Design an enzyme around this catalytic site. Structure first.
Site, PDB file in Angstrom:
ATOM      1  CD  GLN A   1      -2.999   0.842   2.324  1.00  0.00           C
ATOM      2  OE1 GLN A   1      -3.073   0.372   3.229  1.00  0.00           O
ATOM      3  NE2 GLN A   1      -3.699   2.237   2.392  1.00  0.00           N
TER       4      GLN A   1
ATOM      5  CG  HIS B   1      -1.289   4.091  -2.191  1.00  0.00           C
ATOM      6  ND1 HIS B   1      -1.811   4.855  -1.180  1.00  0.00           N
ATOM      7  CD2 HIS B   1      -1.270   2.610  -2.526  1.00  0.00           C
ATOM      8  CE1 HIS B   1      -3.094   3.906  -1.305  1.00  0.00           C
ATOM      9  NE2 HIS B   1      -2.834   2.591  -2.579  1.00  0.00           N
TER      10      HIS B   1
ATOM     11  CG  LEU C   1      -2.233  -5.073 -12.262  1.00  0.00           C
ATOM     12  CD1 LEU C   1      -2.207  -6.006 -11.466  1.00  0.00           C
ATOM     13  CD2 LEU C   1      -2.278  -5.809 -13.482  1.00  0.00           C
ATOM     14  CE1 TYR C   2       0.991  -3.865  -5.857  1.00  0.00           C
ATOM     15  CE2 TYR C   2       1.266  -3.736  -7.408  1.00  0.00           C
ATOM     16  CZ  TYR C   2       1.321  -3.914  -6.845  1.00  0.00           C
ATOM     17  OH  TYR C   2       2.634  -4.892  -6.020  1.00  0.00           O
TER      18      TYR C   2
ATOM     19  CG  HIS D   1      -9.246  -3.500  -1.759  1.00  0.00           C
ATOM     20  ND1 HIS D   1      -9.117  -2.817  -3.212  1.00  0.00           N
ATOM     21  CD2 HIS D   1      -9.022  -1.884  -0.736  1.00  0.00           C
ATOM     22  CE1 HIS D   1      -8.621  -1.309  -2.733  1.00  0.00           C
ATOM     23  NE2 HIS D   1      -8.320  -0.972  -1.273  1.00  0.00           N
TER      24      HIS D   1
ATOM     25  N   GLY E   1       1.174  -8.080 -14.622  1.00  0.00           N
ATOM     26  CA  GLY E   1       1.580  -7.684 -13.229  1.00  0.00           C
ATOM     27  C   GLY E   1       2.673  -6.982 -13.756  1.00  0.00           C
TER      28      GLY E   1
ATOM     29  CB  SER F   1       6.095  -5.009 -11.743  1.00  0.00           C
ATOM     30  OG  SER F   1       7.223  -4.877 -10.972  1.00  0.00           O
TER      31      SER F   1
HETATM   32  C1  COH Z   1      -1.668  -2.644  -2.764  1.00  0.00           C
HETATM   33  C2  COH Z   1      -2.226  -1.996  -1.421  1.00  0.00           C
HETATM   34  C3  COH Z   1      -3.353  -1.448  -1.272  1.00  0.00           C
HETATM   35  C4  COH Z   1      -4.267  -1.861   0.234  1.00  0.00           C
HETATM   36  C5  COH Z   1      -3.502  -3.236   1.277  1.00  0.00           C
HETATM   37  C6  COH Z   1      -5.507  -1.470  -0.055  1.00  0.00           C
HETATM   38  C7  COH Z   1      -6.119  -1.800   1.285  1.00  0.00           C
HETATM   39  C8  COH Z   1      -6.691  -0.960   1.713  1.00  0.00           C
HETATM   40  C9  COH Z   1      -7.212  -0.437   3.098  1.00  0.00           C
HETATM   41  C10 COH Z   1      -6.600  -0.803   5.017  1.00  0.00           C
HETATM   42  C11 COH Z   1      -5.856  -0.804   5.143  1.00  0.00           C
HETATM   43  C12 COH Z   1      -7.515   0.999   2.929  1.00  0.00           C
HETATM   44  C13 COH Z   1      -8.417   1.667   4.036  1.00  0.00           C
HETATM   45  C14 COH Z   1      -7.418   1.932   1.684  1.00  0.00           C
HETATM   46  C15 COH Z   1      -8.388   2.841   1.173  1.00  0.00           C
HETATM   47  C16 COH Z   1      -8.460   3.123   0.180  1.00  0.00           C
HETATM   48  N1  COH Z   1      -7.780   2.292  -0.910  1.00  0.00           N
HETATM   49 CO1  COH Z   1      -6.409   1.087  -0.722  1.00  0.00          CO
HETATM   50  N2  COH Z   1      -5.324  -0.566  -1.054  1.00  0.00           N
HETATM   51  C17 COH Z   1      -4.107  -0.881  -1.659  1.00  0.00           C
HETATM   52  C18 COH Z   1      -3.951  -0.388  -3.298  1.00  0.00           C
HETATM   53  C19 COH Z   1      -4.865   1.023  -3.593  1.00  0.00           C
HETATM   54  C20 COH Z   1      -5.293   0.666  -4.890  1.00  0.00           C
HETATM   55  C21 COH Z   1      -4.486   0.789  -6.636  1.00  0.00           C
HETATM   56  C22 COH Z   1      -6.650   1.947  -4.864  1.00  0.00           C
HETATM   57  C23 COH Z   1      -6.803   2.637  -6.211  1.00  0.00           C
HETATM   58  C24 COH Z   1      -7.095   4.093  -6.395  1.00  0.00           C
HETATM   59  C25 COH Z   1      -5.638   4.974  -6.001  1.00  0.00           C
HETATM   60  O1  COH Z   1      -4.717   4.328  -5.373  1.00  0.00           O
HETATM   61  O2  COH Z   1      -5.035   6.297  -6.432  1.00  0.00           O
HETATM   62  C26 COH Z   1      -6.998   2.195  -3.814  1.00  0.00           C
HETATM   63  C27 COH Z   1      -8.119   3.300  -3.505  1.00  0.00           C
HETATM   64  C28 COH Z   1      -8.262   3.675  -1.524  1.00  0.00           C
HETATM   65  C29 COH Z   1      -9.199   4.774  -2.078  1.00  0.00           C
HETATM   66  C30 COH Z   1      -9.902   5.232  -2.570  1.00  0.00           C
HETATM   67  C31 COH Z   1      -9.326   5.888  -4.259  1.00  0.00           C
HETATM   68  C32 COH Z   1     -10.223   5.505  -4.920  1.00  0.00           C
HETATM   69  O3  COH Z   1     -10.638   4.369  -5.103  1.00  0.00           O
HETATM   70  O4  COH Z   1      -9.799   6.321  -6.437  1.00  0.00           O
HETATM   71  C33 COH Z   1      -9.868   4.281   0.014  1.00  0.00           C
HETATM   72  C34 COH Z   1     -10.140   5.586   0.677  1.00  0.00           C
HETATM   73  N3  COH Z   1      -5.903   1.778  -3.070  1.00  0.00           N
HETATM   74  N4  COH Z   1      -7.319   0.847   0.572  1.00  0.00           N
HETATM   75  C1  LIG Z   2       6.325   1.573 -11.551  1.00  0.00           C
HETATM   76  C2  LIG Z   2       6.476  -0.048 -10.322  1.00  0.00           C
HETATM   77  C3  LIG Z   2       6.766  -0.180  -9.660  1.00  0.00           C
HETATM   78  C4  LIG Z   2       6.723  -1.427  -9.741  1.00  0.00           C
HETATM   79  C5  LIG Z   2       6.047  -2.920  -8.645  1.00  0.00           C
HETATM   80  C6  LIG Z   2       6.626  -3.140  -7.571  1.00  0.00           C
HETATM   81  C7  LIG Z   2       5.317  -4.464  -7.876  1.00  0.00           C
HETATM   82  C8  LIG Z   2       4.851  -5.225  -8.383  1.00  0.00           C
HETATM   83  C9  LIG Z   2       4.758  -6.810  -7.490  1.00  0.00           C
HETATM   84  C10 LIG Z   2       3.111  -7.301  -7.911  1.00  0.00           C
HETATM   85  C11 LIG Z   2       2.668  -7.015  -9.846  1.00  0.00           C
HETATM   86  C12 LIG Z   2       1.613  -8.247 -10.007  1.00  0.00           C
HETATM   87  C13 LIG Z   2       1.867  -9.465  -9.895  1.00  0.00           C
HETATM   88  C14 LIG Z   2       3.364 -10.157  -9.494  1.00  0.00           C
HETATM   89  C15 LIG Z   2       4.095  -9.748 -10.078  1.00  0.00           C
HETATM   90  C16 LIG Z   2       5.694 -10.704 -10.446  1.00  0.00           C
HETATM   91  C17 LIG Z   2       5.674 -11.772  -9.136  1.00  0.00           C
HETATM   92  C18 LIG Z   2       6.369 -12.669  -9.930  1.00  0.00           C
HETATM   93  C19 LIG Z   2       6.412 -13.120 -11.809  1.00  0.00           C
HETATM   94  C20 LIG Z   2       8.247 -12.794 -12.775  1.00  0.00           C
HETATM   95  O1  LIG Z   2       9.051 -12.249 -11.832  1.00  0.00           O
HETATM   96  O2  LIG Z   2       8.085 -12.667 -13.241  1.00  0.00           O
END
Ligand code: COH
Ligand SMILES: CCCCC/C=C\C/C=C\C/C=C\C/C=C\CCCC(=O)O
Ligand code: COH
Ligand SMILES: *[C@@H]1O[C@H](CO)[C@@H](O[C@@H]2O[C@H](CO)[C@@H](O[C@H]3O[C@H](CO)[C@@H](O)[C@H](O)[C@@H]3O)[C@H](O)[C@H]2NC(C)=O)[C@H](O)[C@H]1NC(C)=O
Ligand SMILES: *[C@@H]1O[C@@H](CO)[C@@H](O[C@@H]2O[C@H](CO)[C@@H](O)[C@H](O)[C@H]2NC(C)=O)[C@H](O)[C@H]1NC(C)=O
Ligand SMILES: *[C@@H]1O[C@H](CO)[C@@H](O[C@@H]2O[C@H](CO)[C@@H](O)[C@H](O)[C@H]2NC(C)=O)[C@H](O)[C@H]1NC(C)=O
Ligand SMILES: *[C@@H]1O[C@H](CO)[C@@H](O[C@@H]2O[C@H](CO)[C@@H](O)[C@H](O)[C@H]2NC(C)=O)[C@H](O)[C@H]1NC(C)=O
Ligand SMILES: CCCCC/C=C\C/C=C\C/C=C\C/C=C\CCCC(=O)O
Ligand SMILES: CCCCCCCCO[C@@H]1O[C@H](CO)[C@@H](O)[C@H](O)[C@H]1O
Ligand SMILES: CCCCCCCCO[C@@H]1O[C@H](CO)[C@@H](O)[C@H](O)[C@H]1O
Ligand SMILES: *[C@@H]1O[C@H](CO)[C@@H](O)[C@H](O)[C@H]1NC(C)=O
Ligand SMILES: *[C@@H]1O[C@H](CO)[C@@H](O)[C@H](O)[C@H]1NC(C)=O
EC number: 1.14.99.1
Lengths: 551, 552
Positions: B172, B176, B353-354, B357, B495, B499
């Site tokens: 996260q 971000h 794809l990232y 949740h 992904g 990446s």
């Molecule tokens: C992989 C990391 C990750 C995790 C663990 C996660 C799980 C969680 C989590 C638990 C702690 C909280 C409080 C949030 C809270 C939020 N997440 Co994330 N999300 C994550 C990566 C994302 C992604 C990707 C988006 C899409 C919009 C962006 O990042 O701008 C997202 C968007 C958000 C948004 C609003 C932006 C939008 O969707 O446009 C809120 C609020 N957040 N999410």
């Molecule tokens: C600006 C981009 C920054 C990089 C993003 C950071 C981490 C990417 C992590 C996961 C992406 C999605 C799926 C899994 C990726 C690699 C796993 C091994 C595949 C390989 O290695 O064959």
């Protein structure tokens, strides 16, 4: 003071301080080692012994016409040679870019801030005992003295290569899309955030400015029709900010991509030509695609015009400048098997070297009239009175001035020439010989060897005292030209890398862009690949007058 | 309607309208010719006969553990394998970038406007007869029905690969910096104008923000001391704008590079760790360079930290994620004899794809306490109360959820998951099967083949009717995972290219930057090349607690 002031690291070694009065050189991938990266590796020894000098290569490219005729007509060899040209030249440029005016070490600020011009050499540190580092006197010679003794025109020296006013205004028009200095911020800053051939000088730097210039019908740009002739639209009509003296009549306040182009009628000539060209390409594309909308017609036309520009620049403009018997080629396909970065950052030094003010004649000669600078500046009336046909005919005939060789800067532009010296001093430019070493040239050992002459050399020797502290910009204008040529060695050897890098580093040259579909099909693709300065004028100027970059 | 609505051109062929009713496919450099670029060339026939499927390659990398142990101990061989992992994946990405949400054709606006996320696949045209093009119904299934039936968590499903809360928050925190959606403009727009690993989530996006976060002494970032511990400074002290609800007191309004990191204590945990790392590196650099000023110390520390981040992402983070017995390597020198573009543009589909949740737990378990989402959100008192040490120790041993396999999105973030579906549709995303073909994967022939299961497959079939109109994001969360793995095939194959392009494409990886002197000498360079998640924590967290990305 900074331990790297003396510029101790050679052969592209990196200097870093390791204490208050100690440095270290980083010789990584230089082909050299030792304290100052001066001991060559065994492979480098052989590479150095076998490498011909720039002047040897120049001699070969400008002689043996009979052999070149054969080489030009065998595509395999032409491609092979052009491929080497592109790659060997570009390799001299840091890409991604490195230093700028504020950063003599690599930093994220220097990489990411697009407002700066980049730097081929890092600036001299602020605390260095000497302007050029450690060598020379405590101050550089007076700016005005250098200018008057050595740069100012006494008598007009024509270009022996035959460059005309069509070439001179093309150079100015073309380069002013990527040399747009932000004088509010300083000489090391640019307003051209696209850093290359994006055609902002036609379309505007911002979306706000672009949308004011567009017709939003058929993909076209706005225009007015005076006397049955198509010209750029008005400032009042578009609300496009331009630079004009208050007295200019409303209808001669032409609005175009670049804010400063009303300054010279020669720039408005090309501005008018390119606007017509865009709308001509819109017509072609509307024919091929009755189904397309305004937006797609506009964008596709822009991509095509970028392609046309790059094509003309290589095959007509650089071709002329070079003096070669070998025909240069624009072909993105040549790099598809090479290592090459499709990106560019405009370098401050590339800006500096392109101050070709000696190209300017004493008068601008249209039809039967000979206009002084005072009459020509900000007079779009001249353009409307004579017309584009006459402009092309006259400017194709009028010879331009020689750039190298010394003493050929018109006095009308003396303040600009002086500004080039002063600003490069403000930006703490390293010496001529430091720049020569950076681009694989042999440092000049005397002022006489620089100028190929005695009188200017003597003047310069009194002014600077040491050749190793001679300044880049002045040296470019006094340098011994190649035989019957417009430039000397340093201009070609520095300019060519920056140029080819900016041209080929364009996204449209990359494999995912270089396809007919990008340009609306084979028809649009053909417009690019058959473009020339002749066909640009033929298609857009009444009566299709003959033109070229030479008299 | 647009003649290209049905996506007729195959194998990376580009579709262009040639009239109201007609199209043409541009097959340039695809290896195919014919009306729709489906007739392969001879060389292409040979290449396709000898190319293993992504599934078989995954098998090889996750088995033969003893063989890989030998391979991992042969520098030449490790380099050769890692070199091929980087190149074969990167060629799947357009660079310079092509399409965006407003441009299904190439244009200068699309190329030059950094405010857009780029698009790996062009949007479906505005006048197409169905949302997916020509196939399926006039309207997609209600996203609430999709969400409720196949996405929402019943009982918590733990990740079989053993991902912990350290991994979930690192994911996260890290992503971000480059996923920073510009909500005032729309979901196809970003605020991360650097489009990569620039550490703007630590240093700020603009120079104004950076200068407000900086101490201007010794290259360091401003900080505060609470109970003898180093934390980020306050909004009141910096004048740095942060997103906080009104009820948060002045002293608990921490100011960091990225505006939203106050949202989650898990994010503020990493923010504090990295601020400490920055200031730690400043100390080291001053020891090597007593002659340097504040500006060079700051900048060189930034460059080292970018290096540390990439190093960690590849060798700890992707390593854990991959499940491979082969040891991935961060080594820029592997690409020096290769055709590679040192630039990056963040793709909208990479963002989509990232949205992992399902990684999130039902409660956040620190020491003795179990905090609900409501108690955890915006509550940095939790961080000060327990401290970084207890946070690291607790998160290291708390398991995360499985992402693929269905029904594992916590109900607390129900609205966020629905938004990912809605925004995808708003941005006119092409179907899952289109994206699979775009990445050299076989299209799924049924919903059962997608899920590897019957119950969810049948619910999806009733909602979508046709497998070829299945959406990308829901599919990733319901997809049959690899054996005992966190992800399915589509997640990894989409992904990974995005990446490695983002990591290796960074300017510090380019030959002119990848030198000891860029990083203030050999000591600074070694900080990058020896960086790990454990060392980041050991150097910056009192007591040097043990950590990793798996529960163990
Ligand atoms: C992989 C990391 C990750 C995790 C663990 C996660 C799980 C969680 C989590 C638990 C702690 C909280 C409080 C949030 C809270 C939020 N997440 Co994330 N999300 C994550 C990566 C994302 C992604 C990707 C988006 C899409 C919009 C962006 O990042 O701008 C997202 C968007 C958000 C948004 C609003 C932006 C939008 O969707 O446009 C809120 C609020 N957040 N999410
Ligand atoms: C600006 C981009 C920054 C990089 C993003 C950071 C981490 C990417 C992590 C996961 C992406 C999605 C799926 C899994 C990726 C690699 C796993 C091994 C595949 C390989 O290695 O064959
Ligand atoms: C080779 C083309 C060319 C020619 C013929 C030329 C000769 C002329 C000419 C005669 C018609 C006029 C009226 C101008 C007028 C100007 N030139 Co040029 N300069 C040219 C290329 C440049 C370059 C290079 C710069 C410096 C970049 C900048 O300042 O934007 C320049 C800058 C300018 C500026 C900005 C001030 C400054 O600080 O430099 C003015 C005003 N102009 N110059
Ligand atoms: C990259 O693309 C963005 C989206 O197209 C663009 O933002 C947009 O800019 C336009 C035109 O400048 C703005 O429209 C403006 O129109 C009139 C001008 O008279 C004003 O009355 C309005 O206040 C308005 O500002 C839009 O606000 C904006 N569109 C959005 C956000 O969707 C960026 O400008 C582009 N970036 C660059 C560097 O060009
Ligand atoms: C390449 O284009 C496709 C278009 O998807 C295909 O056209 C289809 O062919 C069908 C018969 O096989 C027709 O019913 C119909 O014309 C069309 N389908 C749709 C949905 O438009 C072409 O046959 C194919 N061409 C070649 C040469 O393989
Ligand atoms: C590396 O470069 C340094 C500085 O350019 C050389 O040291 C100087 O050498 C000249 C000899 O002409 C002396 O006049 C200076 O006083 C020397 N010292 C300094 C501090 O400038 C040094 O010799 C070079 N090293 C090698 C191995 O060639
Ligand atoms: C790129 O660099 C310039 C110069 O360093 C930045 O402009 C400065 O911004 C600060 C704070 O925002 C001002 O106090 C200075 O007056 C500015 N310097 C000038 C105008 O010369 C500029 O903000 C940077 N651009 C970006 C996008 O970060
Ligand atoms: C930033 C985009 C770059 C656009 C190019 C601009 C100008 C090119 C023209 C001249 C550059 C200056 C000096 C080069 C002189 C002769 C070139 C022939 C040398 C060669 O071919 O060996
Ligand atoms: C015509 C405008 C040019 C004015 C330059 C005069 C000021 C510089 O003095 C110059 O000294 C040189 C000594 O070598 C003489 O050859 C030049 O004639 C002289 O101009
Ligand atoms: C606890 C087991 C989860 C059951 C799966 C959810 C099936 C539909 O449950 C839905 O989800 C939300 C949960 O509060 C509610 O807002 C909706 O009203 C409800 O219909
Ligand atoms: C403007 O140019 C015209 C040529 O049409 C000329 O007659 C006039 O003298 C010029 N005016 C000025 C102020 O130079
Ligand atoms: C925040 O966490 C603290 C523990 O530090 C707890 O006592 C408090 O109840 C929580 N606040 C809210 C509003 O949930």
């Amino acid at each position: 003071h900074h331990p790297c002031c003396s510029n101790p690291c050679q052969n592209r070694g990196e200097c870093m301080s390791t204490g208050f009065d100690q440095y270290k050189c980083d010789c990584t991938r230089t082909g050299f080692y030792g304290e100052n990266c001066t001991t060559p590796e065994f492979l480098t020894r052989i590479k150095l012994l076998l490498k011909p000098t720039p002047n040897t290569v120049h001699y070969i490219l400008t002689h043996f016409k009979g052999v070149w005729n054969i080489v030009n007509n065998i595509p395999f060899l032409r491609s092979l040679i052009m491929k080497y040209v592109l790659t060997s030249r570009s390799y001299l440029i840091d890409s991604p870019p490195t230093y700028n005016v504020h950063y003599g070490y690599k930093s994220w600020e220097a990489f990411s801030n697009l407002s700066y011009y980049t730097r081929a050499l890092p600036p001299v540190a602020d605390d260095c005992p000497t302007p050029m580092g450690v060598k020379g006197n405590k101050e550089l010679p007076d700016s005005k003295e250098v200018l008057e003794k050595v740069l100012l025109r006494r008598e007009f020296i024509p270009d022996p290569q035959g460059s005309n006013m069509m070439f001179a205004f093309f150079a100015q028009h073309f380069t002013h899309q990527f040399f747009k200095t932000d004088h509010k911020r300083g000489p090391g800053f640019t307003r051209g955030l696209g850093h290359g051939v994006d055609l902002n000088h036609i379309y505007g730097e911002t979306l706000d400015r672009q949308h004011k210039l567009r017709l939003f019908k058929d993909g076209k740009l706005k225009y007015q029709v005076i006397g049955g002739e198509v010209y750029p639209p008005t400032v009042k009509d578009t609300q496009v900010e331009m630079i004009y003296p208050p007295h200019i009549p409303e209808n001669l306040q032409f609005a175009v991509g670049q804010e400063v182009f009303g300054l010279v009628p020669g720039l408005m000539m090309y501005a008018t030509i390119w606007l017509r060209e865009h709308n001509r390409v819109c017509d072609i594309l509307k024919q091929e695609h009755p189904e397309w909308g305004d937006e797609q017609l506009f964008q596709t036309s822009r991509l095509i015009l970028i392609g046309e520009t790059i094509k003309i620049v290589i095959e007509d403009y650089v071709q002329h400048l070079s003096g070669y018997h070998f025909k240069l080629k624009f072909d993105p396909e040549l790099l598809f098997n090479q290592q090459f970065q499709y990106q560019n950052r405009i370098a401050s030094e590339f800006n500096t070297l392109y101050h070709w003010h000696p190209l300017l004649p004493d008068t601008f000669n249209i039809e039967d009239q000979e206009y002084s600078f005072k009459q020509f500046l900000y007079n779009n009336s001249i353009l409307l009175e004579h017309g584009l046909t006459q402009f092309v005919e006259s400017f194709t005939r009028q010879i331009a001035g020689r750039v190298a060789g010394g003493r050929n800067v018109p006095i009308a532009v003396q303040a600009v020439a002086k500004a080039s010296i002063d600003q490069s001093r403000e930006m703490k430019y390293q010496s001529l010989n430091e720049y020569r070493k950076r681009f694989s040239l042999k440092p000049y050992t005397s002022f006489e060897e620089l100028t190929g002459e005695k009188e200017m050399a003597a003047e310069l020797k009194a002014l600077y005292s040491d050749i190793d502290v001679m300044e880049l910009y002045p040296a470019l204008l006094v340098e011994k030209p190649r035989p019957d040529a417009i430039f000397g060695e340093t201009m070609v050897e520095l300019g060519a890398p920056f140029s080819f890098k900016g041209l080929m580093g364009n996204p449209i040259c990359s494999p995912q862009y270089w396809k007919p579909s990008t340009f609306g099909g084979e028809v649009g693709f053909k417009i690019i690949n058959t473009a020339s300065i002749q066909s640009l004028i033929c298609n857009n100027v009444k009566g299709c007058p003959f033109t070229s970059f030479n008299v």
